[PDB]
Amino acid sequence: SQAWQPGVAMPNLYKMQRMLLEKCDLQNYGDSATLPKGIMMNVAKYTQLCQYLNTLTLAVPYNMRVIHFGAGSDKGVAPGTAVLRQWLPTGTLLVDSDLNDFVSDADSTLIGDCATVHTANKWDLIISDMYDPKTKNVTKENDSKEGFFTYICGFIQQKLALGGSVAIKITEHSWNADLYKLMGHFAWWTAFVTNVNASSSEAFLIGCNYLGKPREQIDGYVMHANYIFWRNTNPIQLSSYSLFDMSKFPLKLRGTAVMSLKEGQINDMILSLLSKGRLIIRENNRVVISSDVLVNN
Amino acid sequence: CAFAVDAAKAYKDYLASGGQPITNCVKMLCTHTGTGQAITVTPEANMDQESFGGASCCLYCRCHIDHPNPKGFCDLKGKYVQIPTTCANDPVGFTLKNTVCTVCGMWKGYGCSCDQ
Numbered sequence: 001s002q003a004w005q006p007g008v009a010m011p012n013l014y015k016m017q018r019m020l021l022e023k024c025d026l027q028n029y030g031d032s033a034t035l036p037k038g039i040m041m042n043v044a045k046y047t048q049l050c051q052y053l054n055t056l057t058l059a060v061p062y063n064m065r066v067i068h069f070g071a072g073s074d075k076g077v078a079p080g081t082a083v084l085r086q087w088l089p090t091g092t093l094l095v096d097s098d099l100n101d102f103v104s105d106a107d108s109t110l111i112g113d114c115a116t117v118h119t120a121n122k123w124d125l126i127i128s129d130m131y132d133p134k135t136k137n138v139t140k141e142n143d144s145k146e147g148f149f150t151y152i153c154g155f156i157q158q159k160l161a162l163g164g165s166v167a168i169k170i171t172e173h174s175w176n177a178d179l180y181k182l183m184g185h186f187a188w189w190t191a192f193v194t195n196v197n198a199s200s201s202e203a204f205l206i207g208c209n210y211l212g213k214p215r216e217q218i219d220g221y222v223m224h225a226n227y228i229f230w231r232n233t234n235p236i237q238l239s240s241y242s243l244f245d246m247s248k249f250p251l252k253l254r255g256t257a258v259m260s261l262k263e264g265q266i267n268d269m270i271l272s273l274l275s276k277g278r279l280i281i282r283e284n285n286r287v288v289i290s291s292d293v294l295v296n297n
Numbered sequence: 298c299a300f301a302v303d304a305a306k307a308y309k310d311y312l313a314s315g316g317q318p319i320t321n322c323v324k325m326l327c328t329h330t331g332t333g334q335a336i337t338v339t340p341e342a343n344m345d346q347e348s349f350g351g352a353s354c355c356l357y358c359r360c361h362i363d364h365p366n367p368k369g370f371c372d373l374k375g376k377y378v379q380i381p382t383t384c385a386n387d388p389v390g391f392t393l394k395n396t397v398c399t400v401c402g403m404w405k406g407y408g409c410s411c412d413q
């Protein structure tokens with residue numbers, strides 16, 4: 001029955017194990033889903049990610065703020081951004097970014113390494129497809145990777161509104177222990193595998209409703225090993241089925257309340273509202289972004 | 298000086314010369330039960346149309362050149378463009394050669410029925 005879902009989320013019991021890290025060996029490796037005629041993998045993938053995010057308690061405020069890292073294709077366009085803009089309520093401010101130049105439907109685009117990106121405002125949703133293919137070295141140990149993951153951890157901690165959510169792409173080799181640990185600072189988390197790309201070890205690590213404090217202690221080395229164990233023992237049948245029913249695609253406009261609060265007034269009552277997807281905590285000022293430019297000869 | 302690169306004319310002439318259209322326009326998944334209007338804030342393809350991310354179908358966006366108007370504004374990027382399915386092999390050429398009726402929002406000759 002999974003084949004009619006947009007994808008498969010990591011079952012809670014696998015999250016609770018203490019597996020050792022093993023090589024990822026997917027039974028359905030090299031299989032491919034048959035995409036609708038003329039549909040790109042990256043459109044299908046973001047469509048299924050958004051269909052799954054429709055089932056979670058995302059905070060959706062008026063004047064929602066979404067930032068999308070790793071948004072450029074090798075063709076110079078932004079398919080994922082186009083899906084996010086289709087999905088998000090009209091009027092949502094959408095900023096995207098990538099190392100290489102691309103043309104985009106986002107309200108603003110920053111070109112450069114994500115470590116050069118700074119924003120004054122906080123964000124309601126952070127999406128990342130950043131991925132470095134150099135990490136796919138099956139011949140050396142699979143250790144926690146830093147690079148852009150280090151930036152992403154700090155960007156979540158400093159610039160994600162309480163109540164906000166993230167979806168960060170990982171793979172067998174592209175992962176970071178602190179990011180998994182950060183998942184314990186949300187009311188709920190999972191690793192989500194799209195049905196169209198289920199032959200790959202990629203997943204999106206989704207933190208749902210940020211709490212700004214550790215709700216649970218997660219060892220990220222153990223959790224990634226648990227994630228691989230799940231993938232290794234649970235073949236996911238490749239499927240495009242959910243792409244053919246878009247009648248309920250748009251994210252529900254929930255009118256979620258936005259409040260400015262200071263660390264001393266986040267009580268258990270507020271935390272429970274955050275946990276339920278009913279509250280965003282941040283300022284409501286102008287969205288201002290910038291890219292640092294290194295000047296040399 | 299009066300010099301200005303004419304990319305629209307160059308692309309049309311390259312098309313007439315038998316050149317392969319610009320590819321990797323971003324086609325969206327949608328119901329195909331939409332209004333069929335030409336340029337919309339969300340995908341609106343009807344049964345005879347495909348919906349594409351606007352920026353990916355704009356010649357000026359895709360070629361990294363200025364948009365031909367004083368303010369250099371682009372009326373495709375950030376929107377979705379409906380392209381007739383029979384013309385969806387060349388969305389950039391289609392948007393370049395066709396015009397939007399300002400009353401009905403449909404393409405002239407591809408959905409506009411105002412002149413009847």
Ligand SMILES: CSC[C@H]1O[C@@H](n2cnc3c(N)ncnc32)[C@H](O)[C@@H]1O
Pocket residue numbers: 069070071072073074097098099100112113114115129130131132147148
């Ligand atoms: C959509 S495929 C993966 C994307 O992630 C981007 N990416 C990988 N590493 C970084 C980085 N450090 N900063 C910004 N983008 C990155 C790549 O340019 C690629 O387009």
Ligand SMILES: [Zn+2]
Pocket residue numbers: 352355356357358359364371372373374
């Ligand atoms: Zn343009």
Ligand SMILES: [Zn+2]
Pocket residue numbers: 398399400401402403409410411412
């Ligand atoms: Zn008309």
